PDB file of C-alpha atoms in Angstrom:
ATOM      1  CA  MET A   1     -38.146 -41.869  -0.860  1.00 61.83           C
ATOM      2  CA  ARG A   2     -34.582 -43.208  -0.917  1.00 60.55           C
ATOM      3  CA  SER A   3     -31.750 -41.001   0.327  1.00 59.27           C
ATOM      4  CA  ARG A   4     -28.624 -42.326  -1.396  1.00 61.17           C
ATOM      5  CA  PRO A   5     -25.610 -41.893   0.910  1.00 60.93           C
ATOM      6  CA  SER A   6     -22.144 -42.273  -0.671  1.00 58.86           C
ATOM      7  CA  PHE A   7     -19.042 -40.064  -1.008  1.00 64.09           C
ATOM      8  CA  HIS A   8     -17.141 -38.325  -3.873  1.00 63.93           C
ATOM      9  CA  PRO A   9     -17.347 -34.784  -2.379  1.00 62.38           C
ATOM     10  CA  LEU A  10     -17.105 -31.207  -3.627  1.00 65.05           C
ATOM     11  CA  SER A  11     -14.950 -31.199  -6.761  1.00 68.00           C
ATOM     12  CA  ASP A  12     -12.478 -28.587  -7.898  1.00 65.46           C
ATOM     13  CA  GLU A  13     -14.669 -27.642 -10.828  1.00 64.26           C
ATOM     14  CA  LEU A  14     -17.209 -26.554  -8.210  1.00 66.43           C
ATOM     15  CA  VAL A  15     -14.640 -24.244  -6.624  1.00 71.08           C
ATOM     16  CA  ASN A  16     -13.266 -23.056  -9.951  1.00 73.93           C
ATOM     17  CA  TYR A  17     -16.767 -22.347 -11.147  1.00 76.27           C
ATOM     18  CA  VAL A  18     -17.824 -20.364  -8.115  1.00 73.80           C
ATOM     19  CA  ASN A  19     -14.806 -18.170  -8.774  1.00 77.79           C
ATOM     20  CA  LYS A  20     -15.148 -17.586 -12.520  1.00 75.50           C
ATOM     21  CA  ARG A  21     -18.715 -16.395 -11.905  1.00 69.46           C
ATOM     22  CA  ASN A  22     -17.543 -13.528  -9.659  1.00 66.21           C
ATOM     23  CA  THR A  23     -20.211 -13.546  -6.956  1.00 67.01           C
ATOM     24  CA  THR A  24     -19.554 -11.682  -3.668  1.00 66.83           C
ATOM     25  CA  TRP A  25     -17.389 -14.483  -2.320  1.00 63.56           C
ATOM     26  CA  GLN A  26     -14.460 -16.777  -3.064  1.00 62.38           C
ATOM     27  CA  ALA A  27     -14.209 -20.533  -2.655  1.00 63.03           C
ATOM     28  CA  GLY A  28     -11.521 -23.077  -1.996  1.00 64.43           C
ATOM     29  CA  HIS A  29     -11.360 -26.544  -0.549  1.00 62.83           C
ATOM     30  CA  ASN A  30     -12.392 -26.842   3.095  1.00 65.32           C
ATOM     31  CA  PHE A  31     -13.222 -30.489   3.389  1.00 68.24           C
ATOM     32  CA  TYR A  32     -10.775 -33.092   2.374  1.00 66.79           C
ATOM     33  CA  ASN A  33     -11.180 -36.826   2.546  1.00 69.00           C
ATOM     34  CA  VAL A  34     -14.621 -36.710   3.896  1.00 69.09           C
ATOM     35  CA  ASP A  35     -17.612 -39.022   3.341  1.00 64.49           C
ATOM     36  CA  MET A  36     -20.839 -37.340   2.154  1.00 64.28           C
ATOM     37  CA  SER A  37     -22.556 -38.799   5.193  1.00 64.58           C
ATOM     38  CA  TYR A  38     -20.264 -36.387   7.049  1.00 66.19           C
ATOM     39  CA  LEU A  39     -21.236 -33.256   5.070  1.00 69.01           C
ATOM     40  CA  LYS A  40     -24.870 -34.145   5.675  1.00 71.40           C
ATOM     41  CA  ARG A  41     -24.832 -34.826   9.429  1.00 70.96           C
ATOM     42  CA  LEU A  42     -22.927 -31.505   9.544  1.00 69.61           C
ATOM     43  CA  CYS A  43     -26.145 -29.826   8.430  1.00 68.45           C
ATOM     44  CA  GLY A  44     -28.302 -31.155  11.281  1.00 72.83           C
ATOM     45  CA  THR A  45     -31.279 -28.778  11.511  1.00 71.58           C
ATOM     46  CA  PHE A  46     -34.907 -29.220  10.398  1.00 74.20           C
ATOM     47  CA  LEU A  47     -36.530 -25.986   9.145  1.00 71.55           C
ATOM     48  CA  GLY A  48     -39.569 -24.614  10.975  1.00 74.07           C
ATOM     49  CA  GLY A  49     -41.387 -26.559  13.675  1.00 75.77           C
ATOM     50  CA  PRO A  50     -42.263 -24.666  16.785  1.00 75.73           C
ATOM     51  CA  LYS A  51     -41.467 -20.987  16.311  1.00 76.14           C
ATOM     52  CA  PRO A  52     -41.438 -19.367  19.799  1.00 76.08           C
ATOM     53  CA  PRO A  53     -43.835 -16.323  19.898  1.00 76.66           C
ATOM     54  CA  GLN A  54     -42.341 -13.000  18.624  1.00 78.08           C
ATOM     55  CA  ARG A  55     -40.040 -10.638  20.522  1.00 74.04           C
ATOM     56  CA  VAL A  56     -42.027  -7.534  19.574  1.00 73.94           C
ATOM     57  CA  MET A  57     -38.882  -5.482  19.114  1.00 77.23           C
ATOM     58  CA  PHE A  58     -39.457  -1.984  20.405  1.00 75.25           C
ATOM     59  CA  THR A  59     -37.784  -0.511  17.338  1.00 74.40           C
ATOM     60  CA  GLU A  60     -38.604   3.198  17.075  1.00 79.65           C
ATOM     61  CA  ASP A  61     -35.997   5.495  18.542  1.00 79.10           C
ATOM     62  CA  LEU A  62     -32.933   3.212  18.252  1.00 73.34           C
ATOM     63  CA  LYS A  63     -30.251   4.558  16.014  1.00 73.89           C
ATOM     64  CA  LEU A  64     -28.476   1.225  15.251  1.00 74.77           C
ATOM     65  CA  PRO A  65     -24.911   1.308  13.771  1.00 75.07           C
ATOM     66  CA  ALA A  66     -23.869   0.708  10.144  1.00 77.10           C
ATOM     67  CA  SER A  67     -21.633  -2.167  11.144  1.00 75.56           C
ATOM     68  CA  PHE A  68     -21.293  -4.130  14.352  1.00 77.41           C
ATOM     69  CA  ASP A  69     -19.264  -7.032  15.775  1.00 75.72           C
ATOM     70  CA  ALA A  70     -20.523  -8.459  19.072  1.00 74.82           C
ATOM     71  CA  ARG A  71     -16.972  -9.556  19.841  1.00 72.71           C
ATOM     72  CA  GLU A  72     -15.929  -5.886  19.908  1.00 75.60           C
ATOM     73  CA  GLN A  73     -18.936  -4.713  21.948  1.00 72.49           C
ATOM     74  CA  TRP A  74     -18.592  -7.276  24.728  1.00 72.45           C
ATOM     75  CA  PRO A  75     -14.810  -7.995  24.771  1.00 71.54           C
ATOM     76  CA  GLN A  76     -15.029  -9.405  28.287  1.00 72.84           C
ATOM     77  CA  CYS A  77     -17.416 -12.120  27.094  1.00 70.40           C
ATOM     78  CA  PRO A  78     -14.921 -14.424  25.193  1.00 68.58           C
ATOM     79  CA  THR A  79     -17.615 -16.959  24.431  1.00 70.62           C
ATOM     80  CA  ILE A  80     -18.436 -14.621  21.616  1.00 68.97           C
ATOM     81  CA  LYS A  81     -15.121 -15.345  19.825  1.00 66.02           C
ATOM     82  CA  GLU A  82     -15.262 -19.093  20.346  1.00 65.63           C
ATOM     83  CA  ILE A  83     -15.847 -21.425  17.413  1.00 64.95           C
ATOM     84  CA  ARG A  84     -16.926 -24.962  18.212  1.00 64.93           C
ATOM     85  CA  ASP A  85     -17.072 -28.362  16.503  1.00 64.32           C
ATOM     86  CA  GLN A  86     -20.148 -30.550  16.323  1.00 62.42           C
ATOM     87  CA  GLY A  87     -18.211 -33.603  15.186  1.00 63.40           C
ATOM     88  CA  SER A  88     -20.133 -35.953  12.866  1.00 64.00           C
ATOM     89  CA  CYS A  89     -23.209 -35.218  14.906  1.00 67.10           C
ATOM     90  CA  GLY A  90     -25.956 -33.061  13.459  1.00 64.39           C
ATOM     91  CA  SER A  91     -25.916 -31.315  16.823  1.00 63.09           C
ATOM     92  CA  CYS A  92     -25.684 -27.855  15.239  1.00 60.70           C
ATOM     93  CA  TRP A  93     -29.221 -26.925  16.306  1.00 63.74           C
ATOM     94  CA  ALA A  94     -27.957 -27.520  19.850  1.00 60.58           C
ATOM     95  CA  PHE A  95     -24.837 -25.630  18.932  1.00 61.34           C
ATOM     96  CA  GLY A  96     -26.211 -22.321  17.730  1.00 59.16           C
ATOM     97  CA  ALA A  97     -28.402 -22.545  20.792  1.00 58.50           C
ATOM     98  CA  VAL A  98     -25.782 -23.030  23.459  1.00 61.12           C
ATOM     99  CA  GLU A  99     -23.141 -20.899  21.694  1.00 59.99           C
ATOM    100  CA  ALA A 100     -25.377 -17.865  21.946  1.00 60.25           C
ATOM    101  CA  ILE A 101     -26.811 -18.842  25.328  1.00 58.10           C
ATOM    102  CA  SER A 102     -23.244 -18.880  26.558  1.00 61.12           C
ATOM    103  CA  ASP A 103     -22.611 -15.306  25.352  1.00 60.15           C
ATOM    104  CA  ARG A 104     -25.859 -13.828  26.639  1.00 59.61           C
ATOM    105  CA  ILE A 105     -25.239 -15.134  30.135  1.00 60.74           C
ATOM    106  CA  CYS A 106     -21.954 -13.257  30.255  1.00 61.35           C
ATOM    107  CA  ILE A 107     -23.761 -10.242  28.703  1.00 61.59           C
ATOM    108  CA  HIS A 108     -26.889 -10.137  30.903  1.00 61.27           C
ATOM    109  CA  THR A 109     -25.294 -11.635  34.012  1.00 63.71           C
ATOM    110  CA  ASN A 110     -23.397  -8.338  34.254  1.00 62.45           C
ATOM    111  CA  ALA A 111     -21.112  -8.233  31.200  1.00 60.68           C
ATOM    112  CA  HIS A 112     -18.418  -9.905  33.333  1.00 60.53           C
ATOM    113  CA  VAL A 113     -19.240 -13.618  34.015  1.00 61.95           C
ATOM    114  CA  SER A 114     -18.409 -16.370  31.482  1.00 62.77           C
ATOM    115  CA  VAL A 115     -19.343 -20.050  31.286  1.00 61.76           C
ATOM    116  CA  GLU A 116     -19.476 -22.402  28.297  1.00 60.84           C
ATOM    117  CA  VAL A 117     -22.897 -23.989  28.139  1.00 59.55           C
ATOM    118  CA  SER A 118     -22.755 -27.722  27.416  1.00 59.69           C
ATOM    119  CA  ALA A 119     -23.890 -28.552  23.898  1.00 62.21           C
ATOM    120  CA  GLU A 120     -23.660 -32.110  25.244  1.00 60.07           C
ATOM    121  CA  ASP A 121     -26.183 -31.614  28.024  1.00 60.51           C
ATOM    122  CA  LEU A 122     -28.741 -30.324  25.517  1.00 63.01           C
ATOM    123  CA  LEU A 123     -27.842 -32.687  22.674  1.00 63.93           C
ATOM    124  CA  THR A 124     -28.174 -35.801  24.825  1.00 61.58           C
ATOM    125  CA  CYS A 125     -30.695 -34.931  27.548  1.00 63.14           C
ATOM    126  CA  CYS A 126     -33.367 -33.071  25.612  1.00 59.84           C
ATOM    127  CA  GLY A 127     -35.405 -35.697  23.796  1.00 60.05           C
ATOM    128  CA  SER A 128     -37.960 -35.895  20.969  1.00 60.31           C
ATOM    129  CA  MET A 129     -38.752 -32.322  22.036  1.00 60.49           C
ATOM    130  CA  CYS A 130     -35.593 -31.170  20.358  1.00 61.63           C
ATOM    131  CA  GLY A 131     -35.822 -34.058  17.908  1.00 63.51           C
ATOM    132  CA  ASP A 132     -33.145 -36.605  17.024  1.00 67.30           C
ATOM    133  CA  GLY A 133     -29.842 -35.758  18.678  1.00 68.24           C
ATOM    134  CA  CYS A 134     -27.069 -36.146  16.086  1.00 68.56           C
ATOM    135  CA  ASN A 135     -29.555 -36.815  13.328  1.00 65.95           C
ATOM    136  CA  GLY A 136     -31.162 -33.416  13.238  1.00 66.06           C
ATOM    137  CA  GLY A 137     -32.929 -31.184  15.676  1.00 67.74           C
ATOM    138  CA  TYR A 138     -35.200 -28.217  16.270  1.00 66.51           C
ATOM    139  CA  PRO A 139     -33.311 -24.985  17.165  1.00 66.94           C
ATOM    140  CA  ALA A 140     -36.494 -23.541  18.630  1.00 67.61           C
ATOM    141  CA  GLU A 141     -36.704 -26.297  21.192  1.00 68.64           C
ATOM    142  CA  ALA A 142     -33.076 -25.961  22.362  1.00 70.60           C
ATOM    143  CA  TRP A 143     -33.777 -22.553  23.777  1.00 70.14           C
ATOM    144  CA  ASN A 144     -36.962 -23.971  25.097  1.00 69.46           C
ATOM    145  CA  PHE A 145     -35.262 -26.834  26.905  1.00 68.69           C
ATOM    146  CA  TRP A 146     -32.804 -24.323  28.383  1.00 68.75           C
ATOM    147  CA  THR A 147     -35.661 -22.294  29.811  1.00 68.01           C
ATOM    148  CA  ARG A 148     -37.438 -25.580  30.610  1.00 64.31           C
ATOM    149  CA  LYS A 149     -34.724 -27.632  32.386  1.00 61.75           C
ATOM    150  CA  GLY A 150     -31.538 -25.635  32.030  1.00 63.36           C
ATOM    151  CA  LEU A 151     -28.042 -26.532  30.791  1.00 62.12           C
ATOM    152  CA  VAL A 152     -24.840 -27.232  32.722  1.00 61.83           C
ATOM    153  CA  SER A 153     -21.319 -26.166  31.789  1.00 60.30           C
ATOM    154  CA  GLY A 154     -19.391 -27.978  29.101  1.00 60.06           C
ATOM    155  CA  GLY A 155     -16.744 -26.932  26.648  1.00 61.89           C
ATOM    156  CA  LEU A 156     -14.945 -28.426  23.672  1.00 65.93           C
ATOM    157  CA  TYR A 157     -13.968 -32.072  23.311  1.00 66.39           C
ATOM    158  CA  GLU A 158     -11.301 -33.230  25.769  1.00 68.37           C
ATOM    159  CA  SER A 159     -11.024 -29.622  27.035  1.00 66.05           C
ATOM    160  CA  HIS A 160     -11.951 -30.814  30.505  1.00 64.65           C
ATOM    161  CA  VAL A 161     -13.942 -27.593  30.926  1.00 62.85           C
ATOM    162  CA  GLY A 162     -17.284 -27.740  32.747  1.00 61.24           C
ATOM    163  CA  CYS A 163     -19.900 -30.247  34.017  1.00 61.62           C
ATOM    164  CA  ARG A 164     -20.204 -32.258  30.795  1.00 64.93           C
ATOM    165  CA  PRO A 165     -17.740 -31.459  27.962  1.00 66.29           C
ATOM    166  CA  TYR A 166     -18.612 -32.567  24.396  1.00 62.02           C
ATOM    167  CA  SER A 167     -17.544 -36.250  24.253  1.00 62.33           C
ATOM    168  CA  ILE A 168     -18.006 -36.437  20.492  1.00 64.57           C
ATOM    169  CA  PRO A 169     -14.564 -35.984  18.906  1.00 64.58           C
ATOM    170  CA  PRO A 170     -13.996 -33.753  15.862  1.00 64.88           C
ATOM    171  CA  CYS A 171     -12.633 -35.225  12.636  1.00 62.42           C
ATOM    172  CA  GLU A 172      -9.700 -33.668  10.788  1.00 61.68           C
ATOM    173  CA  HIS A 173     -11.787 -33.090   7.666  1.00 60.67           C
ATOM    174  CA  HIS A 174      -9.820 -29.988   6.672  1.00 59.36           C
ATOM    175  CA  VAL A 175      -6.660 -32.065   6.296  1.00 61.55           C
ATOM    176  CA  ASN A 176      -4.802 -35.180   5.052  1.00 58.20           C
ATOM    177  CA  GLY A 177      -6.052 -38.218   3.150  1.00 59.15           C
ATOM    178  CA  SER A 178      -3.830 -40.722   4.996  1.00 57.03           C
ATOM    179  CA  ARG A 179      -6.042 -40.718   8.094  1.00 56.78           C
ATOM    180  CA  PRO A 180      -9.538 -42.300   8.216  1.00 60.20           C
ATOM    181  CA  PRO A 181     -12.217 -40.936   5.835  1.00 55.80           C
ATOM    182  CA  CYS A 182     -14.555 -38.679   7.760  1.00 56.33           C
ATOM    183  CA  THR A 183     -17.787 -40.640   7.591  1.00 57.74           C
ATOM    184  CA  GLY A 184     -20.611 -38.595   9.013  1.00 58.31           C
ATOM    185  CA  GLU A 185     -21.810 -41.284  11.343  1.00 56.58           C
ATOM    186  CA  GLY A 186     -22.319 -42.300  14.939  1.00 57.72           C
ATOM    187  CA  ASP A 187     -25.137 -42.113  17.459  1.00 57.74           C
ATOM    188  CA  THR A 188     -26.301 -39.703  20.130  1.00 57.89           C
ATOM    189  CA  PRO A 189     -24.481 -39.886  23.490  1.00 54.97           C
ATOM    190  CA  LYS A 190     -26.677 -41.112  26.331  1.00 55.59           C
ATOM    191  CA  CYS A 191     -28.070 -38.483  28.676  1.00 52.20           C
ATOM    192  CA  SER A 192     -25.707 -38.809  31.619  1.00 50.15           C
ATOM    193  CA  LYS A 193     -27.021 -36.421  34.256  1.00 48.66           C
ATOM    194  CA  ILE A 194     -23.601 -36.135  35.847  1.00 45.56           C
ATOM    195  CA  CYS A 195     -20.585 -33.858  35.632  1.00 41.85           C
ATOM    196  CA  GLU A 196     -17.111 -35.183  34.995  1.00 39.97           C
ATOM    197  CA  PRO A 197     -14.879 -35.824  38.014  1.00 40.46           C
ATOM    198  CA  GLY A 198     -12.647 -32.928  38.997  1.00 41.25           C
ATOM    199  CA  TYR A 199     -15.258 -30.246  38.482  1.00 42.41           C
ATOM    200  CA  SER A 200     -17.412 -29.074  41.456  1.00 36.30           C
ATOM    201  CA  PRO A 201     -20.400 -27.932  41.704  1.00 31.93           C
ATOM    202  CA  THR A 202     -22.438 -31.047  41.000  1.00 28.85           C
ATOM    203  CA  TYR A 203     -24.717 -31.414  37.989  1.00 28.07           C
ATOM    204  CA  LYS A 204     -27.936 -30.024  39.447  1.00 26.52           C
ATOM    205  CA  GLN A 205     -25.959 -27.225  41.001  1.00 26.07           C
ATOM    206  CA  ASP A 206     -24.357 -26.387  37.639  1.00 23.63           C
ATOM    207  CA  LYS A 207     -27.588 -26.105  35.571  1.00 22.06           C
ATOM    208  CA  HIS A 208     -28.173 -22.584  34.111  1.00 21.14           C
ATOM    209  CA  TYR A 209     -31.837 -21.728  33.349  1.00 22.12           C
ATOM    210  CA  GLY A 210     -33.141 -19.286  30.758  1.00 19.86           C
ATOM    211  CA  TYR A 211     -36.117 -17.016  31.345  1.00 25.39           C
ATOM    212  CA  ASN A 212     -37.886 -17.256  27.995  1.00 23.45           C
ATOM    213  CA  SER A 213     -37.574 -18.456  24.429  1.00 27.79           C
ATOM    214  CA  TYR A 214     -38.624 -16.279  21.477  1.00 28.35           C
ATOM    215  CA  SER A 215     -38.654 -15.632  17.753  1.00 31.75           C
ATOM    216  CA  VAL A 216     -37.172 -12.502  16.310  1.00 32.39           C
ATOM    217  CA  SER A 217     -39.344 -11.249  13.494  1.00 29.94           C
ATOM    218  CA  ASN A 218     -38.401 -11.787   9.871  1.00 30.40           C
ATOM    219  CA  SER A 219     -36.969  -8.303   9.632  1.00 28.35           C
ATOM    220  CA  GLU A 220     -33.386  -7.179   9.107  1.00 29.36           C
ATOM    221  CA  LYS A 221     -33.963  -4.207  11.367  1.00 30.37           C
ATOM    222  CA  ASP A 222     -35.506  -6.287  14.165  1.00 29.69           C
ATOM    223  CA  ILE A 223     -32.816  -8.914  14.072  1.00 30.98           C
ATOM    224  CA  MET A 224     -30.192  -6.143  14.274  1.00 28.26           C
ATOM    225  CA  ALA A 225     -31.948  -4.731  17.310  1.00 27.08           C
ATOM    226  CA  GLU A 226     -32.057  -8.118  19.120  1.00 24.45           C
ATOM    227  CA  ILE A 227     -28.323  -8.549  18.597  1.00 24.32           C
ATOM    228  CA  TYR A 228     -27.413  -4.980  19.603  1.00 21.67           C
ATOM    229  CA  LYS A 229     -29.648  -4.877  22.666  1.00 21.94           C
ATOM    230  CA  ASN A 230     -29.158  -8.477  23.746  1.00 21.61           C
ATOM    231  CA  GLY A 231     -26.295 -10.126  21.923  1.00 21.73           C
ATOM    232  CA  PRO A 232     -25.991 -13.011  19.433  1.00 20.48           C
ATOM    233  CA  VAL A 233     -29.040 -14.930  18.333  1.00 21.82           C
ATOM    234  CA  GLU A 234     -29.522 -18.299  16.663  1.00 25.73           C
ATOM    235  CA  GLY A 235     -30.779 -18.597  13.096  1.00 26.17           C
ATOM    236  CA  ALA A 236     -30.794 -21.268  10.408  1.00 24.09           C
ATOM    237  CA  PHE A 237     -30.403 -21.583   6.660  1.00 24.83           C
ATOM    238  CA  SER A 238     -30.350 -24.084   3.796  1.00 27.67           C
ATOM    239  CA  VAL A 239     -26.871 -25.364   2.969  1.00 26.65           C
ATOM    240  CA  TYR A 240     -26.140 -25.944  -0.721  1.00 27.57           C
ATOM    241  CA  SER A 241     -23.056 -27.802  -1.889  1.00 28.10           C
ATOM    242  CA  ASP A 242     -21.373 -24.526  -2.868  1.00 27.89           C
ATOM    243  CA  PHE A 243     -21.329 -23.197   0.723  1.00 27.47           C
ATOM    244  CA  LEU A 244     -19.116 -25.944   2.088  1.00 28.62           C
ATOM    245  CA  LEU A 245     -16.457 -24.374  -0.123  1.00 30.06           C
ATOM    246  CA  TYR A 246     -16.660 -20.956   1.383  1.00 31.48           C
ATOM    247  CA  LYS A 247     -13.407 -19.153   2.138  1.00 32.97           C
ATOM    248  CA  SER A 248     -14.038 -15.399   2.295  1.00 30.67           C
ATOM    249  CA  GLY A 249     -16.243 -12.469   1.409  1.00 31.36           C
ATOM    250  CA  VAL A 250     -20.030 -12.420   1.362  1.00 29.45           C
ATOM    251  CA  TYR A 251     -21.726 -15.721   0.643  1.00 27.56           C
ATOM    252  CA  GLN A 252     -24.458 -15.790  -1.924  1.00 25.88           C
ATOM    253  CA  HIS A 253     -25.654 -19.213  -3.125  1.00 22.05           C
ATOM    254  CA  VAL A 254     -24.625 -19.811  -6.759  1.00 19.34           C
ATOM    255  CA  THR A 255     -24.737 -23.548  -7.667  1.00 19.25           C
ATOM    256  CA  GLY A 256     -24.974 -26.666  -5.560  1.00 18.05           C
ATOM    257  CA  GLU A 257     -27.322 -29.319  -4.291  1.00 15.38           C
ATOM    258  CA  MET A 258     -29.626 -28.721  -1.278  1.00 12.16           C
ATOM    259  CA  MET A 259     -27.426 -30.516   1.296  1.00 11.56           C
ATOM    260  CA  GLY A 260     -29.750 -29.783   4.184  1.00 10.37           C
ATOM    261  CA  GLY A 261     -30.834 -27.323   6.862  1.00 13.53           C
ATOM    262  CA  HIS A 262     -28.111 -26.027   9.191  1.00 10.64           C
ATOM    263  CA  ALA A 263     -28.354 -23.814  12.318  1.00 14.34           C
ATOM    264  CA  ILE A 264     -26.203 -20.794  13.191  1.00 12.02           C
ATOM    265  CA  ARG A 265     -25.270 -18.023  15.629  1.00 10.37           C
ATOM    266  CA  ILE A 266     -25.453 -14.459  14.324  1.00 12.50           C
ATOM    267  CA  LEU A 267     -23.217 -12.107  16.201  1.00 13.94           C
ATOM    268  CA  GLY A 268     -22.905  -9.130  13.907  1.00 13.54           C
ATOM    269  CA  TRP A 269     -23.320  -7.368  10.621  1.00 12.37           C
ATOM    270  CA  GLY A 270     -21.898  -4.899   8.147  1.00 15.32           C
ATOM    271  CA  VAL A 271     -21.296  -4.040   4.538  1.00 15.64           C
ATOM    272  CA  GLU A 272     -18.422  -5.527   2.611  1.00 17.30           C
ATOM    273  CA  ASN A 273     -18.098  -3.441  -0.571  1.00 18.04           C
ATOM    274  CA  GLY A 274     -21.661  -2.434  -1.301  1.00 19.49           C
ATOM    275  CA  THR A 275     -22.677  -5.882  -0.050  1.00 21.90           C
ATOM    276  CA  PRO A 276     -24.649  -5.939   3.185  1.00 19.04           C
ATOM    277  CA  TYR A 277     -24.068  -8.990   5.347  1.00 17.64           C
ATOM    278  CA  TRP A 278     -24.406 -10.842   8.575  1.00 17.89           C
ATOM    279  CA  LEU A 279     -21.339 -11.885  10.595  1.00 18.78           C
ATOM    280  CA  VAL A 280     -21.950 -15.522  11.458  1.00 17.34           C
ATOM    281  CA  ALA A 281     -19.906 -18.313  13.138  1.00 17.51           C
ATOM    282  CA  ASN A 282     -20.074 -22.027  12.309  1.00 18.94           C
ATOM    283  CA  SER A 283     -20.002 -25.322  14.241  1.00 20.40           C
ATOM    284  CA  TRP A 284     -17.400 -26.968  11.989  1.00 19.33           C
ATOM    285  CA  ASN A 285     -14.223 -25.664  13.636  1.00 19.60           C
ATOM    286  CA  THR A 286     -11.834 -22.848  12.903  1.00 17.37           C
ATOM    287  CA  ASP A 287     -10.366 -24.358   9.764  1.00 16.84           C
ATOM    288  CA  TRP A 288     -13.516 -23.873   7.679  1.00 14.89           C
ATOM    289  CA  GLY A 289     -14.190 -20.483   6.137  1.00 13.45           C
ATOM    290  CA  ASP A 290     -12.599 -17.492   7.894  1.00 13.18           C
ATOM    291  CA  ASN A 291     -11.441 -18.803  11.298  1.00 12.12           C
ATOM    292  CA  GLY A 292     -14.729 -20.625  11.638  1.00 11.15           C
ATOM    293  CA  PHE A 293     -16.764 -17.612  10.612  1.00 12.65           C
ATOM    294  CA  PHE A 294     -18.485 -16.656   7.343  1.00 18.68           C
ATOM    295  CA  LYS A 295     -20.544 -13.721   6.032  1.00 19.82           C
ATOM    296  CA  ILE A 296     -23.887 -14.260   4.320  1.00 16.36           C
ATOM    297  CA  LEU A 297     -25.915 -11.801   2.181  1.00 16.61           C
ATOM    298  CA  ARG A 298     -28.134  -9.686   4.466  1.00 15.32           C
ATOM    299  CA  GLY A 299     -31.628  -8.195   4.052  1.00 12.62           C
ATOM    300  CA  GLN A 300     -32.986 -10.649   1.530  1.00 14.25           C
ATOM    301  CA  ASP A 301     -33.829 -13.688   3.681  1.00 11.82           C
ATOM    302  CA  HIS A 302     -31.065 -15.223   1.643  1.00 15.19           C
ATOM    303  CA  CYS A 303     -31.203 -19.000   2.105  1.00 15.60           C
ATOM    304  CA  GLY A 304     -33.692 -18.247   4.902  1.00 15.60           C
ATOM    305  CA  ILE A 305     -31.052 -16.574   7.063  1.00 16.71           C
ATOM    306  CA  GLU A 306     -33.479 -14.080   8.585  1.00 20.49           C
ATOM    307  CA  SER A 307     -36.454 -16.424   8.937  1.00 21.64           C
ATOM    308  CA  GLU A 308     -35.574 -18.563  11.953  1.00 20.56           C
ATOM    309  CA  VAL A 309     -33.967 -16.234  14.508  1.00 22.40           C
ATOM    310  CA  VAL A 310     -34.738 -17.448  18.003  1.00 24.21           C
ATOM    311  CA  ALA A 311     -33.278 -15.804  21.084  1.00 23.74           C
ATOM    312  CA  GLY A 312     -33.721 -15.874  24.815  1.00 22.13           C
ATOM    313  CA  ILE A 313     -32.979 -13.910  27.962  1.00 23.42           C
ATOM    314  CA  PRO A 314     -31.454 -15.574  31.059  1.00 25.05           C
ATOM    315  CA  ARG A 315     -33.111 -15.596  34.500  1.00 23.79           C
ATOM    316  CA  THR A 316     -31.738 -12.852  36.799  1.00 26.88           C
ATOM    317  CA  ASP A 317     -29.888 -13.508  40.093  1.00 25.29           C
TER     318      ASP A 317
END
């Protein structure tokens, strides 16, 4: 083994090609002046590991809709619209986890009470359990740590929102070459069991605990029913070099190298011109894709999209 890290990103010919082929999506340049170490740490999820049981979806007598956008169902739970940034930290497994966890609280805690769960608290305080912090991690075990120990509040970098807000700064990858090259590097922040000054409750007071962690079957129908009945879920999929260039439409892998495994948050679905899809949000800001979101081919375990859906339900009262 010998992973060769370097640079010289996603060409134009890659974009141009993806277009001339006429797949269900159109490319463009998202990352500019970025180091391939960046693009890699961006995809920070290992695939498989410790699948949590199986939410035996009671599907039979549940006339699901043809299309659905969780942002439109629960409009009072804004966490659903929010797109985050993992920085050059393969903290995405922690991201899909807390992004959804955040929604579901507002949804199950009486669709009326929002809080941004700290991707920092989980990223830094979990441990081998979840894996390697910014170097990759197990989505399954994020949910599990939530249920296990809980997660305090904590919004975007320098947002000053919550117990522990993400201290890892984002890089302007979607812009200018005059600034510093975005090298995907750094280390995992140290687990500081303490909220920032200004915010009250304390840390222990602020910890939100889940009730259980579970796997949604590998079934389009089942996944749809988890999302409809309980809100967004967290999945994962293999990122090929062509995906980083996604701009709009329904993503279907055409060309590209197997960059790595990256986690996600599925919040909806639909059909875009005879092309069924899943409405998913990313952890690489609002400049990538369509306002941070992208649509991937549904019902074909495309890139493993429907094979790692883990979800959880919060503890009542």
